[PDB]
Design a protein around this ligand. Structure first.
Ligand code: HPA
Ligand code: HPA
Lengths: 338, 338
DNA sequence: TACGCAAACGTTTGCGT
DNA sequence: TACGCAAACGTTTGCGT
């Protein structure tokens, strides 16, 4: 079709190309004429053809876990912002923690020749670490590990442990000594990693969480609902609970209410993520905030780097969680004794 | 590179192609050998090259408004599911109701030659209707109008009006006659459209909503918070409020609580959307559910149709809202008198 | 029988003049 | 000075034999 444009304009396609990409000087007249045709002809250059020669699609692939989940969604929306402004196109792919699903998206992606790959799989079994390696050729960063699982990729680390610790600390400093915890999947960083930061502060304080007091969640409200239930549904109950994620917490809130327990007056709750609308949780949720925007921008950036400045060596950038005091936590019985 | 594969296998690339696409019979031996090379060589066919000949990228573009918003997110995740299973690749593009932003994504998309276009712009000014037309050549459906704004596209209609009506009705039948409303942007279907369905039921019941009682929202929790405030913050207040969207409602809940108002005991609240976690709103939110999954699947479908069976004529499919009784609504003063 | 040739898809770009 | 030629990018596919 560039051919048809060149014709209407009575010049070479080479010319046409030059004016379309301002890649060499072109007579005003000439340049106008090209536009002229470009317009009537209603021309849309073909990126596929272009990509064929220039060797880069100017498109990036997001190999995600899921996109509805608030936490996730927020990150994604950030990443997209970044692609858009640096001219990239985003191909969002959700694998739902399915190996087969992952092996697929991974493949479709390579085939569509994505300039780079953004990775958010939540859990990384050897089998997954494996496939990922088979693509070391395509530039990629994983945005959700705690340490650097591998050498063939970039990594942004969230400091999910110091997050866990921050949370426990607060509760402790608040007068609490009978605390429960509903963590997320231990096969995930935000899961095991947050739990352990929390657990260290406890040990540090000689606090011992009864096993009847720690209940796995899956980051979904329902899991929170069930955990809280189980927790307050026992003879002896804690005065405070640390909830691995905001959405689950939101679920933990509803159950207390349903059992007629007042929060923070009956149980104090601290969550984690500081999701876009935790402030409007009822009560306004006190939580650890995870910089998600920076998590995205910073991920897009290492990638762009690797891409544009052809970087070869892996790299890793830390990011930092920070406590956000809201209204779901009250003083514990030991406040005054410290 | 297919060339390098053909070589390792000592056969023509044509052969290689045939076995890669099972497009004509190939000797077992032969076929194995090809795979053999395909493997050591570590071959990934190029979709871009392929697309160059076959004329279709097997990729679809989602020209959305934003993706963090629950409502939105849910729809999107559905659409992606559908693309994935019918082999399509999703390019998610957020225009934030920005014309310039839209003119851009639209263009990048055409250029990347997307097989079809999914449209979710929220608001459609003539200027937007205009650009969209310039692309009548690319198959597309808009998933968010109430009626069929144009002839060059497919349309799935949500019946947002009968939704509005359902909501009012309930409130009426519940004993309520002093109702307030916090609608969403009137420049959107889910906004004006839901409001009017609501307003008709009122008129039908000879109920008159005082203007001091209707406050615009923007679908975001904060806007809900402010509206509720303004509403209950007056001398005379309603006993029930219809909230244009769940997330705003969630915001409307927090403010009542903050003003020490009990819900549903002091004010009853009915929302709209039936978002994934309204059940865990505190109280479990009574709302009108919008089939979002079907909204997506049904959108992907008309498109695929247009695509594959080269359909030319516009088409439109209705979908239906339905009331979900939860715990945020209580009997009104007139229940018994009916 | 089972396969190979060569043109074509829509652009970019090294040389020329 | 300001532009045009022709090869090349990686596959698909109509004909042949
Ligand atoms: O893996 C996760 N899923 C959902 N929400 C989350 N918040 C932190 N980690 C997660
Ligand atoms: O335009 C909208 N935005 C956000 N949530 C919504 N729910 C219905 N319509 C909308």
């Amino acid at each position: 079709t560039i051919k048809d444009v060149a014709k209407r304009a009575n010049v070479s396609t080479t010319t046409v190309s030059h004016v379309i990409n301002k890649t060499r000087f072109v007579a005003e007249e000439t340049r106008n004429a090209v536009w002229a045709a470009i317009k009537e002809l209603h021309y849309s250059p073909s990126a596929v053809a272009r990509s064929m020669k220039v060797n880069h699609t100017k498109s990036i692939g997001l190999l995600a876990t899921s996109s509805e989940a608030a936490y996730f969604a927020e990150i994604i929306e950030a990443v997209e912002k970044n692609c858009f402004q640096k001219g990239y196109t985003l191909i969002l792919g959700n694998a739902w923690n399915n190996l087969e699903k992952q092996r697929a998206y991974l493949s479709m992606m390579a085939q569509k020749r994505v300039d780079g790959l953004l990775v958010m799989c939540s859990e990384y079994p050897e089998p997954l670490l494996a496939m990922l390696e088979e693509y070391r050729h395509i530039p990629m960063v994983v945005m959700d590990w705690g340490e650097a699982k591998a050498d063939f990729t970039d990594a942004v680390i969230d400091n999910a442990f110091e997050g866990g610790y921050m949370a426990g600390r607060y509760l402790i400093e608040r007068g609490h000594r009978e605390i429960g915890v509903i963590p997320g999947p231990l096969e995930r960083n935000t899961g095991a990693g947050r739990l352990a930061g929390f657990m260290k502060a406890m040990e540090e304080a000689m606090i011992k969480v009864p096993e009847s007091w720690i209940v796995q969640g899956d980051f979904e409200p329902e899991s929170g609902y069930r955990a809280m239930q189980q927790i307050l549904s026992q003879p002896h109950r804690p005065t405070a609970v640390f909830c691995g994620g905001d959405i689950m917490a939101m679920g933990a809130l509803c159950a207390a209410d349903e059992m007629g327990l007042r929060v923070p007056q009956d149980v104090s709750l601290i969550g984690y993520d500081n999701v876009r609308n935790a402030r409007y949780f009822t009560p306004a949720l006190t939580t650890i905030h995870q910089p998600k925007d920076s998590l995205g921008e910073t991920a897009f950036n290492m990638l762009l780097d690797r891409i544009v400045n052809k970087r070869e060596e892996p790299q890793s950038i830390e990011v930092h969680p920070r406590l956000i005091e809201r209204r779901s936590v009250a003083d514990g019985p030991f406040r005054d004794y410290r």
